[PDB]
Design a protein around this ligand. Sequence first.
Ligand SMILES: Cc1cccc(Nc2cc(Cl)nc(SCC(=O)O)n2)c1C
Ligand SMILES: Cc1cccc(Nc2cc(Cl)nc(SCC(=O)O)n2)c1C
Length: 263
Amino acid sequence: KSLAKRIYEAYLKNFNMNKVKARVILSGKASNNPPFVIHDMETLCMAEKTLVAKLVANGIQNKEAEVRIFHCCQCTSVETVTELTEFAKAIPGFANLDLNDQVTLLKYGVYEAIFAMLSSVMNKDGMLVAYGNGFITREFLKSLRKPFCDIMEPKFDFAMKFNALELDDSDISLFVAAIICCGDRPGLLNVGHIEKMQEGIVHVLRLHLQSNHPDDIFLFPKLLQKMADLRQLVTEHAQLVQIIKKTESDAALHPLLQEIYRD
Ligand SMILES: Cc1cccc(Nc2cc(Cl)nc(SCC(=O)O)n2)c1C
Ligand SMILES: Cc1cccc(Nc2cc(Cl)nc(SCC(=O)O)n2)c1C
């Protein structure tokens, strides 16, 4: 409970979007600057005009939507990986890890953490983008050509099963820290120091859930399973991005993300 509060602090401090902010928009007004809704190329075109005006002047609307939606995804992945880094530095004992240990835990935990947190900004109909000023629909996303249609569906699939657990952000902050401090990660130099960390977070997490959701007895074991799915989800996800990199003409990877995929 003592450790929990600081992780819940670091969580709120370091992420521009959270479940409360996201439901505020997904649930309704949001009376000022309401999300643009994106269901087709026309509204996609409308949103770019408003939001990324510099790009539109640069001629991006000549490119197919599959590629602009994909480059939009990378930019957000890059925003979040930066936020995930600053968040980890605020988890106790993380800064004290050897720097190669710090670099390693983040290489493997971020896409798992990204996908878990993505669930907070989704409902069955769609997901928020552009810092809450855009809402792109799941169906427009399925409308897109292969392999581009295949990226978001597995994550929408998880989000509904995940959002159904009805976690609050205090839950999610401990959950995201635990993903990060996994000691099973390859290439670690000081595994005991790190396993020692995971042992701590998971205790407070087991304890917070017990208090936060006294009614849901099976919630904790259910969450541990959620961690395994994300690894597979991330593994399958990686397989898809490799297919796109070798295959699609304008699917350039961002350099930061390219560092993530080296192993
Ligand atoms: C969902 C959404 C909201 C706002 C703008 C856009 N269009 C974008 C966004 C980004 Cl980050 N990049 C592009 S094209 C980039 C390039 O020429 O490499 N197009 C999109 C796809
Ligand atoms: C918070 C948020 C909302 C929407 C999209 C994303 N980034 C994603 C999500 C998914 Cl399922 N796929 C991609 S493709 C490029 C990449 O490998 O980061 N990018 C993120 C990080």
